[PDB]
Amino acid sequence: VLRKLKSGLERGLDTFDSTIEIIMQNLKTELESQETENFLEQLISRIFQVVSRLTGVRIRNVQVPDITMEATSENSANVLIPITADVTVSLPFLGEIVDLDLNVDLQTTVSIETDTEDPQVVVGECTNNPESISLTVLHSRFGLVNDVVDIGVNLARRVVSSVVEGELCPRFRELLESLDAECVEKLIGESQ
Amino acid sequence: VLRKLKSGLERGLDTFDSTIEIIMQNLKTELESRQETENFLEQLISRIFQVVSRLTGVRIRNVQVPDITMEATSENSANVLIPITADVTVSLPFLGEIVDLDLNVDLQTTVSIEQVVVGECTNNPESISLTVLHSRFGLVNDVVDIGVNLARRVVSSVVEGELCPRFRELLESLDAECVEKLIGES
Ligand SMILES: CCCCCCCC/C=C\CCCCCCCC(=O)O
Ligand SMILES: CCCCCCCC/C=C\CCCCCCCC(=O)O
Ligand SMILES: [Ca+2]
Ligand SMILES: [Ca+2]
Ligand SMILES: [Ca+2]
């Protein structure tokens, strides 16, 4: 069972590693003003390093290729965060059952309230859509068509889904809420 | 890995099921009045393996003793042979049932008259035979090997810890004349 991960996610994975909180604060200050993506790679790696200690799902080599902003209207934009990582699933007695490529696309919206010189920022929902999590099989020492692979892919999906809901989406919203209203207004500007 | 079985074997598997000791006593009385003894042995061994099923994901049932044979080695000594057959299923976490095996175990000890002496009951790995019948995960891949290895270790530790000692204990309960009468059949 993923009991250990479920209890860990209830507490917050940051209760297992003091450095997550520090990286969060580094991201806050950096956002006031290439490097932000580097700080995000660090935050996500450390969260996944804690998941590696609680589960046999080991997620390494975390990259954020490019953070994009697409204007949805004059006063709203989607903020897009593409994540890649290498995944290996291990079970007791069997050791390494499968190596996967992971793609996660986190999306959230920022809006500015219309008809005011003192605009309020609203950050929308961070939806954990199963279509946003992609797992590709690279290798299994048991054979690619073996049933262990399917169990491996399923276990990885559950872990990744639960840490998107429990950690990444909440921190994505928390980091957007740290932006001053003018900064958001300026960034939603020339998203057009 | 097998901690729970190892702790179980140190206590005695009969501390988990009051019926084992009753079946032991049934076998003792039944012997004094020398199929049926084999039926009591099937029951004793099933129950020991029912306890092992509670301590491990190695489930052993359909336990049979085809025929107990005694071959006279001299006028006052014989080899006593007990063939055991059983169906085995190994389960692991997340995978569930990984393999179904056929188990054959051949226990051998000697009984002599001095005073009855029962010889050692040797746990030879050649005396435990495990045959693959079915696997969800392929017949010759590494899942099966892990399954067969776990079953061997469990069966080996239960032979050493429970079956061989009970085999010796039951033979040592026979009086000298009983053994002389049974060796009577070379
Ligand atoms: C665990 C995931 C946390 C994600 C936190 C994201 C915080 C950063 C948010 C917004 C950055 C500003 C948008 C930049 C748009 C310009 C385009 C570019 O940078 O290439
Ligand atoms: C766990 C194993 C315990 C074994 C206890 C040993 C019991 C042996 C009993 C009697 C031996 C007499 C053998 C005579 C041959 C004919 C018997 C027969 O085949 O039915
Ligand atoms: Ca650290
Ligand atoms: Ca498959
Ligand atoms: Ca949380």
Side-chain angles (χ1 to χ4, degrees):
Chain A
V1 189
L2 292 167
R3 163 64 52 81
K4 272 159 80 218
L5 176 62
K6 187 257 194 185
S7 282
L9 286 167
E10 279 164 19
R11 296 178 167 157
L13 295 189
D14 71 8
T15 61
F16 300 85
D17 183 2
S18 58
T19 55
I20 290 158
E21 301 75 311
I22 289 168
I23 311 177
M24 275 299 282
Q25 314 206 289
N26 293 158
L27 264 167
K28 301 284 176 70
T29 317
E30 183 56 27
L31 286 171
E32 314 303 339
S33 317
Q34 314 104 288
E35 190 132 50
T36 75
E37 309 204 17
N38 295 343
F39 281 137
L40 279 167
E41 286 175 356
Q42 329 200 325
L43 177 56
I44 296 170
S45 305
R46 211 80 91 163
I47 290 165
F48 278 124
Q49 283 164 50
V50 169
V51 174
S52 295
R53 284 194 302 157
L54 298 169
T55 72
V57 183
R58 194 175 167 213
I59 296 163
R60 294 172 58 65
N61 191 26
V62 175
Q63 327 247 54
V64 179
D66 202 16
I67 299 196
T68 282
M69 260 199 56
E70 309 187 18
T72 56
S73 81
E74 197 141 310
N75 324 294
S76 55
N78 305 340
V79 181
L80 288 80
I81 303 190
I83 304 161
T84 68
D86 303 331
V87 184
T88 297
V89 189
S90 296
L91 306 176
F93 298 107
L94 271 59
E96 287 184 359
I97 60 169
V98 67
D99 303 314
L100 315 163
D101 268 330
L102 173 70
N103 296 275
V104 188
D105 299 316
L106 306 182
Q107 207 189 130
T108 100
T109 66
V110 285
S111 302
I112 266 304
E113 179 202 330
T114 56
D115 296 319
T116 337
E117 81 282 21
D118 209 310
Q120 178 72 246
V121 164
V122 332
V123 340
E125 298 290 28
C126 186
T127 60
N128 187 15
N129 194 312
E131 294 143 323
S132 299
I133 301 167
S134 168
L135 286 164
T136 311
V137 177
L138 304 177
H139 173 267
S140 180
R141 97 179 154 82
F142 300 93
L144 295 171
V145 302
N146 189 284
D147 278 355
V148 294
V149 172
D150 296 319
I151 291 157
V153 169
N154 287 345
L155 188 68
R157 186 172 294 280
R158 288 192 53 199
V159 165
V160 169
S161 176
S162 66
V163 344
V164 169
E165 182 173 330
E167 288 300 343
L168 303 190
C169 266
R171 288 163 188 282
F172 187 5
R173 291 192 75 261
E174 175 177 8
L175 291 174
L176 290 167
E177 285 172 334
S178 87
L179 275 61
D180 208 36
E182 87 148 84
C183 187
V184 172
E185 190 183 326
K186 200 276 160 203
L187 259 156
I188 277 189
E190 45 67 5
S191 300
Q192 276 71 32
Chain B
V1 285
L2 285 176
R3 283 106 172 84
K4 192 149 80 152
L5 177 59
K6 285 181 215 160
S7 283
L9 286 167
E10 275 279 274
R11 276 52 177 285
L13 293 194
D14 60 31
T15 61
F16 299 85
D17 182 1
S18 56
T19 54
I20 288 159
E21 316 87 67
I22 286 82
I23 310 272
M24 196 68 45
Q25 173 52 76
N26 294 339
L27 262 170
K28 292 197 196 271
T29 316
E30 187 54 29
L31 287 169
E32 289 173 347
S33 44
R34 285 320 234 85
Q35 54 158 76
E36 204 146 50
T37 73
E38 292 177 20
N39 297 342
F40 286 124
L41 274 183
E42 286 178 357
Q43 290 176 57
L44 178 53
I45 298 173
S46 302
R47 213 79 79 153
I48 291 160
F49 278 124
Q50 284 163 53
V51 170
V52 171
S53 292
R54 284 164 56 194
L55 301 167
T56 72
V58 177
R59 194 190 57 171
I60 297 165
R61 43 165 198 184
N62 196 20
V63 175
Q64 328 234 44
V65 181
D67 309 275
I68 300 176
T69 58
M70 179 177 299
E71 353 176 288
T73 57
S74 81
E75 187 210 38
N76 67 30
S77 54
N79 301 334
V80 183
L81 183 79
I82 308 193
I84 307 169
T85 69
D87 305 327
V88 183
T89 299
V90 188
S91 299
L92 304 176
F94 294 107
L95 271 55
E97 288 184 1
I98 58 162
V99 68
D100 295 326
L101 315 164
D102 266 14
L103 171 72
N104 301 279
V105 191
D106 296 318
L107 274 38
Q108 207 221 246
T109 198
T110 65
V111 282
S112 301
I113 301 171
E114 145 175 350
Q115 289 286 18
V116 168
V117 179
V118 64
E120 76 199 336
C121 184
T122 59
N123 188 13
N124 316 303
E126 57 263 52
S127 79
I128 296 162
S129 166
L130 284 164
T131 318
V132 177
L133 304 179
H134 165 74
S135 182
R136 183 183 159 200
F137 303 97
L139 283 184
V140 177
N141 89 113
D142 277 347
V143 171
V144 166
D145 289 329
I146 294 162
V148 168
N149 181 257
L150 281 174
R152 188 171 290 281
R153 291 171 73 204
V154 166
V155 167
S156 173
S157 63
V158 175
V159 167
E160 192 191 25
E162 288 298 342
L163 304 185
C164 267
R166 287 165 191 289
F167 182 14
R168 292 186 76 259
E169 176 177 339
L170 289 176
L171 292 172
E172 287 211 32
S173 84
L174 305 171
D175 65 37
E177 266 303 358
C178 188
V179 167
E180 193 189 354
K181 191 177 130 61
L182 292 171
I183 291 175
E185 299 68 3
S186 35

mmCIF file of all heavy atoms in Angstrom, chain A residues 144-147 149-150, ligand 4:
data_model
loop_
_atom_site.group_PDB
_atom_site.id
_atom_site.type_symbol
_atom_site.label_atom_id
_atom_site.label_comp_id
_atom_site.label_asym_id
_atom_site.label_seq_id
_atom_site.Cartn_x
_atom_site.Cartn_y
_atom_site.Cartn_z
ATOM 1 N N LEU A 144 8.973 -6.165 -21.932
ATOM 2 C CA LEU A 144 8.095 -4.971 -22.085
ATOM 3 C C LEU A 144 6.613 -5.369 -22.040
ATOM 4 O O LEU A 144 5.804 -4.514 -21.625
ATOM 5 C CB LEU A 144 8.389 -4.272 -23.415
ATOM 6 C CG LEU A 144 9.779 -3.657 -23.576
ATOM 7 C CD1 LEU A 144 9.988 -3.192 -25.013
ATOM 8 C CD2 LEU A 144 9.973 -2.520 -22.600
ATOM 9 N N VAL A 145 6.276 -6.587 -22.480
ATOM 10 C CA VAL A 145 4.882 -7.117 -22.526
ATOM 11 C C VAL A 145 4.531 -7.828 -21.208
ATOM 12 O O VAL A 145 3.371 -8.257 -21.094
ATOM 13 C CB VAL A 145 4.685 -8.072 -23.719
ATOM 14 C CG1 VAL A 145 4.992 -7.389 -25.041
ATOM 15 C CG2 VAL A 145 5.501 -9.351 -23.572
ATOM 16 N N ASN A 146 5.458 -7.937 -20.241
ATOM 17 C CA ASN A 146 5.209 -8.640 -18.951
ATOM 18 C C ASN A 146 4.202 -7.831 -18.125
ATOM 19 O O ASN A 146 4.156 -6.594 -18.289
ATOM 20 C CB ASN A 146 6.519 -8.891 -18.205
ATOM 21 C CG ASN A 146 6.377 -9.786 -16.993
ATOM 22 O OD1 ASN A 146 5.891 -9.359 -15.954
ATOM 23 N ND2 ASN A 146 6.873 -11.004 -17.092
ATOM 24 N N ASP A 147 3.414 -8.489 -17.270
ATOM 25 C CA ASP A 147 2.351 -7.821 -16.468
ATOM 26 C C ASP A 147 2.982 -6.936 -15.387
ATOM 27 O O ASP A 147 2.270 -6.034 -14.878
ATOM 28 C CB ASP A 147 1.416 -8.819 -15.785
ATOM 29 C CG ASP A 147 0.312 -9.382 -16.654
ATOM 30 O OD1 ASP A 147 0.173 -8.938 -17.814
ATOM 31 O OD2 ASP A 147 -0.392 -10.274 -16.158
ATOM 32 N N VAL A 149 5.244 -4.706 -15.767
ATOM 33 C CA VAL A 149 5.345 -3.332 -16.346
ATOM 34 C C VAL A 149 4.056 -2.551 -16.036
ATOM 35 O O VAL A 149 4.152 -1.458 -15.444
ATOM 36 C CB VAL A 149 5.660 -3.402 -17.852
ATOM 37 C CG1 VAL A 149 5.583 -2.038 -18.515
ATOM 38 C CG2 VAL A 149 7.011 -4.068 -18.095
ATOM 39 N N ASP A 150 2.893 -3.108 -16.367
ATOM 40 C CA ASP A 150 1.563 -2.467 -16.156
ATOM 41 C C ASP A 150 1.412 -2.080 -14.681
ATOM 42 O O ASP A 150 0.962 -0.964 -14.398
ATOM 43 C CB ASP A 150 0.421 -3.387 -16.604
ATOM 44 C CG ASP A 150 0.457 -3.675 -18.092
ATOM 45 O OD1 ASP A 150 0.741 -2.720 -18.826
ATOM 46 O OD2 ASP A 150 0.219 -4.864 -18.509
HETATM 47 CA CA CA C 4 1.089 -4.903 -21.011
#
